[PDB]
Design a protein around this ligand. Structure first.
Ligand code: HEC
Ligand code: HEC
Ligand SMILES: O=C1O[C@H]([C@@H](O)CO)C(O)=C1O
Ligand SMILES: O=C1O[C@H]([C@@H](O)CO)C(O)=C1O
Lengths: 125, 125
């Protein structure tokens, strides 16, 4: 859906920006510094769910640029593993949110964050 | 969820960027230049659905900046009307997509686009 590689870059960056906001805004809740409203969190994680699936299609062939390391393309299977592991941890966060359990939510949140960071450490400049 | 007004700006711009991609990528389909796969479109409009609800919460009090006209805040009821009309036209596009009918889709797509543009004409610098 991208006319030029730069359009794919702008898309994936914008998707990541929204991901960071919908993930990060729960930090005060998982830490207890903000109240836990199970319905609020369930709704937010559904938004994060949808957003979390979007960046990967914007790393197609020929879309090298931005802060994406070239290894994303030459090591496609390893990058796909990182993305699917991340999306699997998103499924677990959704389950914790849907269950309404703050303990489970704080564990699942941590697992998601570690997945974000493991991918950045390997594949983000 | 925004530490500083600039964070709200960056959010709403990124949400708009994704909206433009998930709306605009259907142009070749509504024009007939690309094939119409009803399931593909139904899935894409569900993504657009979710995205379409996101910008408005990032125009809260004190988040003046970017290319947002100050009138968004001093004419809050008119801006809310523009956003709700837009979201209502998104509901109609969802119904056309869910029904699998290209004629309906091309009419609803046009209505959505006009709603985007009417808001920009009034409230985007
Ligand atoms: C690989 C499987 C990744 C996972 C999982 C996550 N991110 Fe990521 N992110 C990745 C890349 C390769 C890039 C660079 C994209 C480019 O072309 O520049 C990014 C970028 C970001 C950014 C910065 C975006 C910007 O405005 O430029 C953020 C804020 C970001 N990513 C956040 C983020 C979060 C919160 C994640 C888990 C919830 C996450 N990313 C996962 C690759 C991958
Ligand atoms: C008001 C009710 C709006 C509707 C409906 C739509 N948009 Fe919009 N958009 C609006 C404002 C006030 C702004 C400026 C935000 C800022 O602070 O700068 C925007 C911006 C955009 C942009 C540019 C984003 C960027 O990268 O800076 C785009 C591409 C955009 N909007 C697209 C868009 C589409 C495709 C819409 C309907 C599907 C749509 N917008 C609706 C306000 C409003
Ligand atoms: O909110 C965020 O979480 C991840 C990472 O910091 C988690 O360790 C990331 O890259 C964000 O923007
Ligand atoms: O794809 C888009 O559609 C609207 C407008 O051009 C429709 O008239 C907009 O602002 C986009 O980025």
């Amino acid at each position: 859906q991208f006319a030029k590689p730069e359009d794919a870059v702008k898309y994936r960056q914008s998707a990541a920006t929204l991901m960071a906001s919908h993930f990060g805004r729960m930090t005060p809740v998982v830490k207890g510094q903000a109240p836990y409203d199970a319905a609020q969190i369930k709704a937010n994680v559904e938004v994060l769910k949808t957003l979390s699936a979007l960046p990967w299609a914007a790393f197609g062939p020929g879309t090298e640029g931005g802060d994406a390391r070239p290894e994303i393309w030459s090591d496609a299977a390893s990058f796909k593993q990182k993305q699917q592991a991340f999306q699997d941890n998103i499924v677990k966060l959704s389950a914790a949110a849907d269950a309404g359990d703050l303990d489970k939510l704080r564990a699942a949140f941590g697992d998601v964050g570690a997945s974000c960071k493991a991918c950045h450490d390997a594949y983000r400049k």
